[PDB]
């Protein structure tokens, strides 16, 4: 069992107000045919327009909530809403566009999807709370067929052009008019009682219902993220590299070692309490400190209450708590960050996808009231020696080295400082924020050179 069988039953109760008389007994095969699509018994990488929940989770970066509201359906205009916030009105003759024929609406759909998804995914997964009009509107902007490649590159085709009779991926589809071989999933098939708003509002207070199609599209994708990444968590699923994942992860390890090593040198804590990842390793293995570990998996719903969790210093490296103790070293992902790795999430939270998917609770400035922002600094006690890249003399008050103490930064420590600054800026721009106990002072590191 790899894909969703077309002979699987599709519950049609949610469709019967828009489609009265619809059979209760219905397969994906018959539904796809009713939607105006002919599959022609094809064994060419596209067995079904609909996909399993497991396949949707593997392709979370492709998810686009989609809703169609019958604005007045052959004779009536339709409001097409997307989880990007776009509302397009299609006439059969929070961004709200005026009524236009399908031949121009389809061009906009292709541009919008291509700009949203080109740096995220090789496909689109339309996330529905299906009532009928959305499924029957698909024929006006979707073409299907065998799996194909782009006319300008090796990527799989996501768009088709009637003007040129060619196929393109999301990066090369300028001027294309049809969405080609999209995927879709009906959330309503998962077993819910009551309408979209009542189920969404049980878990989220951030998305309202301004009664437009884009609001429903947003709520649908939000509910789907909640079910698949908040209440259910699968950390075995690996996601492809689409950006700076490796540099960010390597910068995270470098910054963690730097900051913890300096805090231990500056304040000489006898014990460190490492709270988080049950598979954590000592980030400063040469430190004299009594290192004690406490297991906590990432909280994907609400931040851990400090009282419900369980002297010296506490290390919370991505272990999200409601209020950090004053004696802490903290790395907290800022959910508001705009990046190709960070997808919109549930109840203010965000879905951070870097090797694994981590639904992260909303960033809250009040968690850090007992702490202060950790300032940038570079510390090194390694010998001053080049060994082995051109040079311009480094002058910096934050290069905490023996050579800078002696009045002149050596070439080795200048190269290491600049590499560290690049790693630091990478990690910060990825959305990570750093916080520390108020007594932390880098002036206390200079006396480690005596
Ligand atoms: C506390 C903990 C346990 C297990 C793994 C991780 N790893 C993480 N690595 C990177 N980003 C993360 C996370 C958790 N959240 N966010 C946002 C953290
Ligand atoms: Zn291409
Ligand atoms: Zn929501
Ligand atoms: Zn030096």
Curated annotation (Swiss-Prot):
Q: Which residues form the active site?
A: 67, 69, 134, 211, 216
The signal peptide here is: none
What catalytic reaction does the record list?
Answer: a 5'-end (5'-triphosphoguanosine)-ribonucleoside in mRNA + S-adenosyl-L-methionine = a 5'-end (N(7)-methyl 5'-triphosphoguanosine)-ribonucleoside in mRNA + S-adenosyl-L-homocysteine
Specify the superkingdom: Viruses
The segments labelled GpppA-binding in the record are 346-360
- The residues listed in the UniProt record as binding Zn(2+) 15, with positions renumbered to this chain, are 200, 204, 207, 222
Compartments it resides in: Host cytoplasm; Host endoplasmic reticulum
Q: Which ranges carry the ExoN domain?
A: 49-230
Amino-acid positions noted as binding Mg(2+) 2 in the UniProt annotation, renumbered to this chain: 69, 211, 216
- Species per Swiss-Prot/TrEMBL record: Severe acute respiratory syndrome coronavirus 2 (2019-nCoV)
- What is the protein's given name? Guanine-N7 methyltransferase nsp14
**Where is Zn(2+) 14 annotated to bind?**
150, 153, 169, 172
Q: Where does Mg(2+) 1 bind?
A: 67, 134
Q: What does this protein do?
A: Plays a role in viral RNA synthesis through two distinct activities. The N7-guanine methyltransferase activity plays a role in the formation of the cap structure GpppA-RNA. The proofreading exoribonuclease reduces the sensitivity of the virus to RNA mutagens during replication. This activity acts on both ssRNA and dsRNA in a 3'-5' direction.
Which residues make up the binding site for Zn(2+) 16?
Answer: 384, 403, 410, 413
Binding-site positions, S-adenosyl-L-methionine: 274-280
Q: What is the annotated quaternary arrangement, including any partners?
A: Interacts (via N-terminus) with DDX1. Interacts with nsp10.
Where would I find the N7-MTase domain in this sequence?
239-450
Q: How is its activity regulated?
A: Inhibited by Remdesivir antiviral drug (GS-5734).
Outcome after substituting residue 19 to V: In strain: Omicron/BA.1, Omicron/BA.2, Omicron/BA.2.12.1, Omicron/BA.2.75, Omicron/BA.4, Omicron/BA.5, Omicron/BQ.1.1, Omicron/XBB.1.5, Omicron/EG.5.1
């Amino acid at each position: 069992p790899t894909h969703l069988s077309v002979d699987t039953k599709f519950k049609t109760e949610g469709l019967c107000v828009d489609i009265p008389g619809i059979p209760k007994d219905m397969t994906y095969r018959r539904l796809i045919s009713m939607m105006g699509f002919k599959m022609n018994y094809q064994v060419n990488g596209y067995p079904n327009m609909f996909i399993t929940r497991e396949e949707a989770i593997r392709h979370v970066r492709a998810w686009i909530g989609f809703d169609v509201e019958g604005c007045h359906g052959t004779n009536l205009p339709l409001q097409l809403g997307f989880s990007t916030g776009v509302n397009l009105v299609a006439v059969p003759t929070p961004l709200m566009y005026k009524g236009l024929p399908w031949n121009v609406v389809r061009i906009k759909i292709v541009q919008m999807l291509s700009d949203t998804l080109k740096n995220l995914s090789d496909r689109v997964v339309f996330v529905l709370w299906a009532h009928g009009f959305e499924l029957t509107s698909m024929k006006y902007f979707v073409k299907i067929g065998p799996e194909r490649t782009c006319c300008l590159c090796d990527r799989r085709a996501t768009c088709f052009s009637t003007a040129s009779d060619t196929y393109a991926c999301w990066h090369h589809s300028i001027g294309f008019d049809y969405v080609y071989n999209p995927f879709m999933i009906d959330v309503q098939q998962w077993g819910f009682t009551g309408n979209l708003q009542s189920n969404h509002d049980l878990y989220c207070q951030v998305h309202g219902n301004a009664h437009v199609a884009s609001c429903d599209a947003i709520m649908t994708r939000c509910l789907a993220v909640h079910e698949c990444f908040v209440k259910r968590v699968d950390w075995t699923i690996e996601y492809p590299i689409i950006g700076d994942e490796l540099k960010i992860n390597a910068a995270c390890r470098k910054v963690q070692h730097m900051v913890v090593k300096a805090a231990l040198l500056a304040d000489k804590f006898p014990v460190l309490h490492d709270i988080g990842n049950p598979k954590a390793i000592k980030c400063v293995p040469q430190a004299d400190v009594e290192w004690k570990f406490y297991d906590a998996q990432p909280c994907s719903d609400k931040a851990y209450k400090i009282e419900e969790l369980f002297d010296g210093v506490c290390l919370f490296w991505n272990c999200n708590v409601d209020r950090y103790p004053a004696n802490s070293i903290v790395c907290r992902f800022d959910t508001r960050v705009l990046s190709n790795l960070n997808l919109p999430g549930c109840d203010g939270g965000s879905l951070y996808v870097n090797k694994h998917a981590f639904h992260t609770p909303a960033f809250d400035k009040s968690a850090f009231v007992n702490l202060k922002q950790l300032p940038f600094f570079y510390y090194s006690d390694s010998p001053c020696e080049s060994h082995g890249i051109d040079y311009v003399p480094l002058k910096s008050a934050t290069c905490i080295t023996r050579c800078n103490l002696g009045g002149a930064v050596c070439r080795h420590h200048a190269n290491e400082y600049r590499l560290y600054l690049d790693a630091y800026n990478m990690m910060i721009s990825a959305g990570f924020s750093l916080w520390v106990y108020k007594q932390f002072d880098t002036y206390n590191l200079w006396n480690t050179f005596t």
